[PDB]
Design a binder for this molecule. Structure first.
Ligand code: YHQ
Ligand code: YHQ
Ligand code: YHQ
Ligand code: CL
Ligand code: CL
Ligand code: CL
Ligand code: CL
Ligand code: CL
Ligand code: NA
Ligand code: NA
Lengths: 631, 666, 524
């Protein structure tokens, strides 16, 4: 009952699902109780083929059957699922539902200003997706290409993503808050052939310069051949470059409301999602989609009658998986909110839920803290009795915020799903299944299907057996929606996720496991570099070098090494002193913590320099490293 | 029994199919009787999924099965059939028959001069199609590209079409009678990367300049990268442009007689066919693959009653939809021989059609009333020279067939022993819409009879826009749901498609025709409502002719209307006002100078019957031309013009009447 | 009993398979005796549909079923097999075995110097093929393209061929001994978009100029957009051209250990192989089936066996029987980079003993070199693992046949004299291991689907009866028959199909004795 390590768990009563949850539930739940959940989970770990095989044929529609459910290992970074299978993301998110019930709502779009809100049915969505795909197809976009999206969180963003996927190309969504420089970096790394954007945006009543920032970036993006521009404000002063920029409404009017979707392999890339050097996290098609549908269905308890409001942005993985793919795969309506939680006032989130009788709400604690600070009294003004599942994503939720969320939004009648996951996981890793798992406020509870979670000692990399334990959070095998690579940089992928703790997937997070098996996310770890099995701290070495009174500044970075895995390179600003500094680190940290080399002369720049790859300071590091690295 | 609206039907005895039809029929008919037809038709309307699903799985060979028979609505212009399916048109027209019986005749080609006639088996056709496709593939032609064809009605035209379709590309066939300008317009709108043509043609013994017209147009077609030229005359004086033009025989010799066909989706475009309407710019009608092919096979089989033992002679040209569907795709899908006639009905004499039928013992003949009117006028005495006892189905396409011509067709060609199929349809419908099924539906001469499978026809009141319930009715002819072979768009101009076919009568397809429905449910086509002119089976745009006349800088205004013609069905009458003209002695010469303009701009077949020189055209208060007055005068109905005090220039009406009365004859 | 024409057949004793062959055989033979072979052979001629249909389904893995087994005729040069079906050469050679037994050896690579030797399992091979395929895919290589290979006989050559076929493109292997001009003529004729080579080579201890020859030829090969250069020696002084030349290790590191294979049609080109030089084209399904069929039955390969084909991927022998044949059957294949003389003349035998190779395939030219200067080295090594010895490329004199059988085979192995050409794809006439008794100097009976005949050159009429001589020809096409000469089908017709219309012209003269055994006389 008592915990000596997981202090968070001491004195925490399980919180059973409120009875009103099941009264509002449209059908019998997908899982009866925790005993059934454990039986299914154990199979998903010991017999992935027998577990995910049938589910993949149930939840997804295939153009070609797969012959192997699961292939590859973490250690080799060659994970693959449903090999030989072929499918299309937009067919599974649009076509199949439009044929069944074309009038069912698909995108409930709430604009920055409600006067501009509107609803697209699945039939409406198929026509818009088909028309945009037709425009891109006539522009030469085909399987294997990348297309950039720089759009606000509205229908056009969702249509653009699904149209790109309809042709077998990968979309790369760029958050509409990014600067021109951030657009340039991501477009060039992906070598996008086309870009979809709009003239201007609306956020909190203000006008944002969307197209203007694209033009600024495009002067340095030679791969972009054509741009489709939607008239979001229809400002006549917004310039379009002849021969490159074309209007969404003008071009889409030329094409018919049906276009055949293009089959892609299960392991063909569905999208690139750049992370904040930006890395293009790449996701497969079949595996990702299954994870999105599976987690949306079982963790949120989503039925055909339900309505999902994910207060996220397609610019981030949350919007990808739980505003778009998850809900549309299951054929339910999804609420796409373009504005802010405060405009026109601080009751907007709740006005939207009441308007559309949303049954599921998914938001980040950052937004809950704001509404608690400035708009708490607005919540009671709205009927929120349609809700039964309240989700939280992206960051620790304190027990105090959990209770506030539970009381003021849920009226102590909803289930709360504190979902732990990350961009590279594609979908939920640890979360309480709605109506199944009892909650402990601040704990994500059990690992999800196909997620064999473990705790690793950060020094030895060895799994920690038993409960009341703490350590590095790691997964012991790959899972269907796991990211497959970093675009054209698979070595950075291996060095980040598979090599730090060989045989495991490295989440970068620390966590604790209590006597009931519940996981408590404890936050980021301290970025250790693995040199021949000894894990080193770049920050700890910098501190040891600085202790030398002749040293004024010190910067230590890590790079890939073909022999020792990683190598540590230390840069110092003030031959015999170089050896004295290495001896200093040995006697301070340890004999095996000595840098591979000490160079007397933004660590992002130092890493690339060390691997042969105040702006005026950059010159000194390049020439200094190239002259004294030698031995 | 009595009709108050449909006067055509009053006193019209049903004409049962002659007994000799069933003695000549090689097998049990495809449909038992008219009652079975009604039952099947109702299912094609109420349960399209259960009806067309099985038929598509019987008649077409699939590389991938379809998961949904039917999608979309007219109102949204998103029709689709057999979604998820994959197939190839050339596989279903050639490969599968060549494997079954490679020696069976496929293309029975009758050249302009019979000494050049020849027969291609299905095996022969597979090898040539593979070779031409091999050339196009090495030129970079791939799925999604368009390829132009400018060929006479011969074996090379069919081979070109099937080779383009073998690669997954869409062909755009350009009628060999078109001028250079008309070739330019069609090639540029489709952005064709390649063109297939020949050096010269043969028609009626005369030599036609095919390649010469391409060179002229290609100076303004920057997208065309390479041209394949067949040696039809092998005239060494025909220039080939280095680096662009290549010889069919030289290039095809580099590639093998088999090329794997390329799978395409049911809804990938099979071809573009540019059509004239009421706009003045030709619009490229687009057809899907699966739906179009099924319609072609289904109508060829059930309306004409085509069996494997049969032989079909469609007296048409692939430059028009009739040759597409019923000289090529229809018959080849069903695996029967089809007769490809390069010549005219008059050369070497007016018995050619019947010499061909007798030579090859054709069982089915498909022709335009324009030819029947000509053969009745000039060649009736030729029929008795030929044995036509192999025929049992006589078809009529493209224009109204008067009861007199119907009787003439029935007696002098069919010997009152064949079934007649007056087929109503149009380019955008892909295949037959209303037609009497051979051996099943009794005929009323001049009536297309019942709508075909999947065609829910209706009549719409022109005043109220509401559908007319009940029979003995007349109105705008409209279709209430889309059908497999319905055109899917206008190339890169889907808005023009919607505004033309789907938006005029929301929820319906607008055929452009008016029609009447009698007490028996038989439909009587009454002609276009949208002032489209059909001259000798050729669908023309009055606006496109006006534009050609205006290009002549000696012309200031031009207005073109249509009238009835005892020979061509309809005739085009052009009214022209000259800037600073006069010269009554130069009038005869200037009228011919304008006719030559239309020939060199559009083509010889678009030339007006008559050009009328007037001082100015009757216009409205806003200055726009009142073509109604030109129509009424041109049809001798000048006493029906009515109140003209709403024109800005009512005094011009007197001049129009006298000008037409003075220059129409001479 | 006596031969008036086939003087080679007079007084030649049949040589039954030694009993030790069957003691070393891991499983029951695939054919019991000659009488069971003749039943199968007659069906493969009278009924190609019912014979090769089921065999194609047993031996190859299909992504799409085929609808017609056989189409076309020789006279029309439109031969085709398994029409409508789709597959992938690299899936059948790598993927499907890696999923079953990822740790089974695939490429037993013996380098010029043994210190550099290594072994790739099927699991290893799948990851290397995928990374190299992923490189080519990013460079724009797609189905329909050709990619040239200028590599020695080592892992990288087999990985390049399989990685090119993985995308649906056609590899055009160029023997690493060719001059810059010979490289140029082939690259331009095929219009390759990319090339895969190495910096330098090691043969017999000598360093060979590989990249330097490519660069000399590339100055006249505009179609080549990018070159992948492996570091076989890692010599710093080897110039890579900025913007065109990239390093194998550097690019492959950017891509994952799995890439989905691309489906191709049965009759899509698997490769071009040049013999001015003419690009012989082989289909995918036909060629692969013939390769697996001949390897399974003429050599009597079983899953437990280990094939050592001392050939070179620059020629057809390395295509069909160093790579596609053994990999399709999921057995390990031995890839030897160096010469039989370095470090000494016991190199072949030290290799056979090292990896317990069960099959050995070599040309008589190497046998004449070893009989001349390496006969003493054979006794030092243990060759008791062998049971099938192969001869290819040249006529084998009864002298060489008797020396090959005793010194190498210890008079305990079966010798298969395989006669075939680059245009045949696989064996045309050969003695099946453990089935067909031997006559030294003879190739014995035609193989499945090979209807062999003799034609009188003067009269051009097929010669009925036995004890005959004349030009050798086949009466119908077979699955692995070359389908054309790249972009020049007329040269193909004039060479093979038009000399004797209705027949395939081998260009060789042969004799058939009263037992039906064929004797290859040579070129006409
Ligand atoms: C979800 C998506 C937006 O995340 P990313 O942007 O990829 O960042 C992922 C990182 O976020 C943090 N995290 C996500 N979920 C939770 C949670 N439930 N409790 C506590 N920390 C959480 C972790 O540090 C994770 O590695
Ligand atoms: C068939 C193909 C060549 O037609 P298009 O050239 O596309 O022109 C179509 C138009 O032709 C006319 N029409 C066709 N068939 C008949 C018929 N049986 N009776 C009376 N009018 C007919 C109609 O006005 C139709 O809209
Ligand atoms: C195998 C491959 C490398 O051959 P190619 O390089 O295409 O040359 C083929 C020519 O080689 C000769 N030949 C091959 N095998 C034998 C043999 N067993 N007995 C006698 N002559 C043989 C023949 O003249 C053949 O036409
Ligand atoms: Cl594996
Ligand atoms: Cl040291
Ligand atoms: Cl719909
Ligand atoms: Cl054939
Ligand atoms: Cl050479
Ligand atoms: Na396919
Ligand atoms: Na398939």
């Amino acid at each position: 009952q008592t915990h000596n390590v997981v202090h968070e768990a001491n004195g925490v009563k399980l919180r059973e699902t409120p009875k009103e949850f099941f009264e509002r539930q449209p059908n019998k739940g997908h899982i009866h109780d925790v005993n059934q959940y454990k039986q299914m989970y154990e199979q998903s770990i010991k017999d992935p083929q027998g577990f995910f095989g049938p589910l993949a044929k149930e939840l997804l529609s295939w153009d070609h059957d797969f012959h192997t459910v699961k292939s590859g290992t973490l250690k080799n970074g060659d994970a693959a699922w449903f090999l030989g299978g072929e499918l299309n993301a937009s067919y599974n998110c649009v076509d199949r539902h439009a044929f069944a019930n074309p009038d069912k709502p698909a995108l409930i779009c709430e604009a920055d200003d409600e006067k501009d809100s509107h609803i697209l049915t699945y039939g409406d969505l198929l026509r818009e997706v088909s028309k945009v795909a037709g425009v891109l197809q006539s522009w030469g976009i085909k399987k294997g290409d990348t297309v950039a999206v720089y759009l606000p969180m509205n229908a056009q963003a969702i249509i653009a993503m699904l149209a790109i996927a309809r042709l077998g190309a990968a979309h790369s969504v760029i958050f509409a808050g990014f600067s021109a420089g951030s657009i340039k970096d991501r477009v060039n790394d992906a070598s996008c052939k086309a870009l979809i954007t709009c003239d201007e945006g609306k956020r909190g009543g203000r006008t944002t310069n969307i197209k203007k920032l694209c033009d600024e970036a495009l002067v340095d993006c030679p791969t972009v051949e054509k741009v489709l521009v939607y008239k979001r404000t229809n400002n006549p002063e917004i310039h379009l470059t002849e021969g490159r920029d074309y209007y969404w409404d003008v071009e889409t009017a030329k094409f018919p409301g049906y276009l055949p979707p293009v089959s892609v392999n299960s392991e063909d890339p569905l999208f690139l999602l750049y992370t904040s050097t930006p890395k293009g996290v790449v996701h497969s098609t079949a595996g990702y989609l299954l994870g999105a549908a599976l987690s949306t269905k079982y963790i949120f308890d989503i039925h055909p009658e339900d309505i999902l409001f994910t207060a996220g942005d397609v610019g981030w993985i949350t919007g990808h998986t739980y505003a778009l793919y998850g809900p549309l795969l299951l054929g339910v309506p999804t609420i796409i909110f373009e504005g802010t939680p405060a405009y026109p006032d601080y009751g907007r989130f709740w006005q939207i839920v009441e308007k559309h009788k949303a049954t599921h709400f998914y938001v980040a604690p950052t937004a809950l803290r704001l509404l608690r600070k400035a708009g708490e009294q607005e919540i009671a003004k709205y009927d929120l009795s349609s809700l039964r599942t309240l989700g939280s994503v992206g960051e620790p939720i304190s027990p105090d915020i959990w209770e506030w969320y539970n009381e003021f939004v849920g009226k102590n009648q909803c289930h709360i799903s504190d979902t732990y996951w990350q961009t590279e996981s594609g979908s939920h890793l640890i979360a309480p299944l709605a109506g199944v798992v009892p909650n402990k406020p601040g704990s994500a509870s059990y690992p999800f299907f196909g997620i064999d979670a473990a705790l690793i000692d950060p020094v030895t990399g060895v799994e920690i057996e038993g409960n009341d334990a703490e350590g590095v959070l790691a997964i012991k095998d790959h899972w269907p929606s796991m990211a497959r690579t970093v675009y054209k940089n698979h070595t950075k992928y291996m060095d980040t996720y598979m090599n730090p703790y060989p045989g495991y997937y490295f989440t970068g997070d620390g966590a604790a496991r209590d006597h009931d098996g519940y996981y408590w996310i404890r936050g980021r770890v301290d970025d250790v570099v693995n040199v021949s099995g000894h894990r080193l701290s770049t920050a700890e070495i910098e501190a040891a070098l600085i202790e030398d009174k002749k040293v004024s500044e010190a910067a230590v970075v890590g790079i890939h090494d073909d022999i020792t895995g990683q190598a540590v390179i230390a840069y110092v600003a003030l031959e015999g002193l170089r050896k004295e500094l290495v001896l200093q680190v040995r006697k301070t940290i340890g004999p095996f913590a000595a840098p591979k080399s000490v160079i007397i002369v933004m660590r992002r720049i130092l890493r690339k320099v060390s691997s042969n790859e105040n702006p005026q300071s950059v010159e000194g590091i390049i020439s200094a490293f190239g002259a004294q690295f030698g031995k």
